[PDB]
Design a protein around this ligand. Sequence first.
Ligand SMILES: Nc1ncnc2c1ncn2[C@@H]1O[C@H](COP(=O)(O)OP(=O)(O)O)[C@@H](O)[C@H]1O
Lengths: 341, 694
Amino acid sequence: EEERSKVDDLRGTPMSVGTLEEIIDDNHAIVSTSVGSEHYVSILSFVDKDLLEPGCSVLLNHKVHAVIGVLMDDTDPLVTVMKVEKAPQETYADIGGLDNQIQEIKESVELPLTHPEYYEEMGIKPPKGVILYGPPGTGKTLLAKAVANQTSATFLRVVGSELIQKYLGDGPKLVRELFRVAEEHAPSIVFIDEIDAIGTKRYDSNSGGEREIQRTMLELLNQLDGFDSRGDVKVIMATNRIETLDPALIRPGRIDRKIEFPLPDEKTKKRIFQIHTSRMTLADDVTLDDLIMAKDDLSGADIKAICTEAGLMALRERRMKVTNEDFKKSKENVLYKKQEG
Amino acid sequence: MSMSGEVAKEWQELDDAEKVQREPLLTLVKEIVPYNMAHNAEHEACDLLMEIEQVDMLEKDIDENAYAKVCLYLTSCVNYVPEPENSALLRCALGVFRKFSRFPEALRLALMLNDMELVEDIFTSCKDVVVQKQMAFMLGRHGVFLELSEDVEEYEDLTEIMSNVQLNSNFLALARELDIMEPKVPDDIYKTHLENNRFGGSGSQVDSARMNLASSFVNGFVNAAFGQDKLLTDDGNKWLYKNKDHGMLSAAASLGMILLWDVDGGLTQIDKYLYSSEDYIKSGALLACGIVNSGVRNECDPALALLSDYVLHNSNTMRLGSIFGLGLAYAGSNREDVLTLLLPVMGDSKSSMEVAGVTALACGMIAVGSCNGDVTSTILQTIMEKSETELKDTYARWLPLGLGLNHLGKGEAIEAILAALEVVSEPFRSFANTLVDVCAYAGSGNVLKVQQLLHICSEHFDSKEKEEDKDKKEKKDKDKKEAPADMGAHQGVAVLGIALIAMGEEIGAEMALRTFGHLLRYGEPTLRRAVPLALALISVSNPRLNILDTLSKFSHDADPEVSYNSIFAMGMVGSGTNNARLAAMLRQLAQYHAKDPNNLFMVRLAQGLTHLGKGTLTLCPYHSDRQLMSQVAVAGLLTVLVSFLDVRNIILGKSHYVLYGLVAAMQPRMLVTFDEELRPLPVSVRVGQAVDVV
Ligand SMILES: Nc1ncnc2c1ncn2[C@@H]1O[C@H](COP(=O)(O)OP(=O)(O)O)[C@@H](O)[C@H]1O
C-alpha cells in the first residue's frame, strides 16, 4: 500500500534496462550492460535473488543503477519457432488398416500423460520415446499420427539440422535451447522431420567440415543422452532412409521403437480413397475400386491428390461433382505425373 | 422472355418481374426450358431467380427447391401482401410433403443445404407473425424440429404429437440429444413436479402393452428407487393384473432381493475385525465407532443389543451411528422398527442434539419412503411436542433431512412451525443451522415460497440469513440458467457466487470452467478457500484430468483451511474411480509434522478414493489396508485422532453393502452429504461429528 508510494521515488523517475551477468556471493551482483556498466545490488524486494541467475537481463536505476525488478522477455526466435499451437483437425481415425502400426505407438502416445498408472504399477519405466521411418517419402501419414497426438500435452515439429549448417558452429546451440526450452514447456513432445544430416550432403550458406556437422548430430543425441536429463519432451524422430543415421542413436533412445511403414495394399487404398471423395460428390459411373484396383504401388498422397485433377476441370466448369470420364482420363495426368515425372 | 437468354452478362435479371408481372403470365415455361437445358449458354442459374417466382405462384413444388440451390440469398425476401404469401405457403407446405417419401419408406433426404436451409429461411417469416404449424410436424424430419422451436418456457413443451413407436424411438432419441444442452431433459420426470398423473401414466405406458420385454425399466426401476413416492404414483398407474402388484412394490421384496444380491458379490468381514475391536473395547474418538455396525449389520439383532446398551451411557454423540443402526438394521428391507424407533425420542427437554436429538433424527433419516403415511404425522406431532428445548439451532439442522427427501411436494408444511423459534437471534450458530434447515425442507418450485418466507422472516431483514435465503431461491430452480442472471449483485460476502455456480448449473458438459475460473481469479483474498467446493457437482464428468491437476498445487499450501477444503473438494466426486497416481501420492502426506485434524483428514479421506463399497473377497485384499492403518497409528502416540482414522477408513471400507454409484447414476444427489459437507468447512468441535453419519 504505502510501500508502493514509497519506493517509487527510489525507482523514480525512470529506470534503465541492464543485463544480469555475475554475482559476488555476498549477493552484490556484478553486471555487464551497455556499455559494460556494473553495480552491486543486494535489495530486499521482488527477489527471488537466486533464480534471476547469471546470463539474463535486469532493470537498473539511474542513481545509482540498482536493479529493482526483472522480466522474462521473448518473443525472440527461440519461442517463435516452437509454436503456435496448433492441433489441426485431422485425427488417427483417418488412416485405417495401419492401426497395427499405430496401436504399437498407441501405448507410446497414450501412456505418457494419459493413462499413466500401469507404467508405474509395473514400475518398469518405459519412457524411451519413439523413432520413425518408412518408404518412399512418408512421415506425413505419420503426421496423420502426429496430428492425432495433438489431443494430448503439447508438441513442436522441427525439420533437420539446417539451423546449425547455416554457419560455422554455433555448436548445436540452437538445438540446445530447442531441447532445453522443451524442458521449459515440459511435459511436451518434440519431433524432427526426416533427418537429412549426412543423408543430404551439401549445405546452404557456409558450413564444414563433416565432423562439425557429424558432432552437431553427435551432440544432438549426447545432449539428449543425457547427463543427466529426466526432461520430457518425449522425443519423436524420423528419417525415411535408415542407412545414413549413425546406428548408435538407437540404444540410448529411442531403443524400443522405429515404426516400419508398409506400402498401401489393394484394400488399404480402398480404405484410404473414399475418405477423400466422401466430400467430393462422384458422378454415377464413378467407382473407387476398379481404378485403384488396376493401379499398383501408389502413395496415400497421390490417391489423395488424384482427386485434385478433377477439382480443376469440374471446377473450371464450376461443378460440385466429380466425373469418372474425366477422373479416368485426368488420372492419366497424375499417371503421367508418376510415369514421366 | 427473350432478355433472360441474352449472351450479355450485364446485370440484372433479378426483380425485373416485379415491374411487369401480369403481362408475362401469358407465356409459359416452354420458352424458359431451352435456356436452362442447353449448355454453353449465358445466365444458366441466373434465370432461376425469375423462374423461382413463376413456379412459386403456380403451386408446383419440388421445382422450387431445385431452382433455389444456387440463389441461397433472395429466397428470404421474395415478392408484399401477406394473403398470397400465407396461401401459396400453406399450399406449398402440404404440397412438398407429398413429393417426399413416395418410394415409399424413405430413402431420407437428401441437414442438406437445399431443403433444410430453404425450409428454415421461410420458417423465419413463418415464426415471425402469421399462421402457425409449419412443415416441421408434417414432414417428420427431426433435423427441422430442432429449428422449429423458439425461445420459450419449456414447462409446457413436454407434450408432443403421438405417433408409432418405430418413429417415436428416433424421435425421443434426437430429442434427448437436443435437450441435454437445454436445462430441461426427458429425464425431468424425476425432479418434476409436475407431480400430475400424466408422467406416471406415460411412464407406465412406455412399455405398453408388452408385459414380457418390460422386465427392464420396471423391475430394475422399482428395486433401484429408494423413495416410495415413485412406487406410490406408479402403483396407481400400474394396470398389470389386479391389486397383487404390491408384492414387488413397497420396496419390501425389492430391497430383500437386492440385499441378497449384494451378499452374493460380497461380503464384508464381521467376526474377525469387529471382535478384534471388541477386545480393544471402546475407542477414544466417540465419533465414528457407531456408524460401523449401522451399515455392517444389517440385519443381526444381537449386536444391536450391545449398541443400545452401550449408548445408554449417553456420553457425547457416540449414540449417533448406533441409534441410526438401530433403525437401519431392521429397515434394511422393511418396514421396519418405526414403532420402537420413535420411542426413545420422547423418552430421552433434550436438551441438545447429542442427547435426545440422535433418536429424534433416526426416524426422520432412516425413514426413506415414509410417510406411509403414519411417519409424517408422527414426526410432525413428535416435533410439536418439544419446541423450546430443541430449540432453533442444533437439532433443527438435521430435521428437514427426513421430509423433503421422501416427498418434495408434500402438502404438510413443517417449515412454519419450525420457524416460529427463529427469535433466538444468534448470528453464529444460525449460519450452519438456517442454511440447510430452510434448504432441506422442500424443493419448492412455485416461486411463492421464497417470496412468502422472505417477507415474513426478514421484515426488515436478518442481514445474514438472507444470504443463504437467496441461495435457497437459487437452489430451488434446478439449472434453470437464471443463476448467472442472479449473480450480478456480487456482495462482499461472496458465499452467493460459490453456491450459485455449483448448484445453479447442472449439465453433462462442464462449460463452467470460464465462470468458475473467473470467480477465483477476480475474487478477493480468502475467498479462494471456498472456491474449490463447487467440485462436488460439475466435476462428475471427467474428474481425472481436472481435479488432481488443479488441487495438486493447493494441496501443498501451508494454510490448514484451504488444505482442509482442497482434499474435501476432491472428496466423494473423485472417489468413484481409482488410479496409481493417487496411491503413489499417498506417500509423504502422512509424514508431515503438522498438527490439528487437517493432517489426518487430508490423508485418511484420501485413502477412501481407492474404491467405494467394493471388496474384499472379491476383490481387493483387506490386508494392505490393515497394514497401512497399523503402521500409521504408531505415531504421537495418542493423539487419539489415530484411533479416529483407523475406524474412519473402515467406515466406508468395511461397510460395503451399498454401491454408489454415484450417488447417483439416475442423477439424484445425496441430500445428507452436501449439507453435512458444508458445516465442517469451519469445523471447530462437534460439527464434523454430525457429518460422520455418511
Ligand atoms: N487413410 C488416409 N486418409 C487420408 N490420407 C491418407 C491416408 N493414408 C495416407 N494418406 C496420405 O498420404 C500422404 C503421404 O504423406 P508423406 O509421404 O508422409 O509426406 P511427407 O513427405 O510429408 O512425409 C499423407 O499426406 C496423407 O495425407
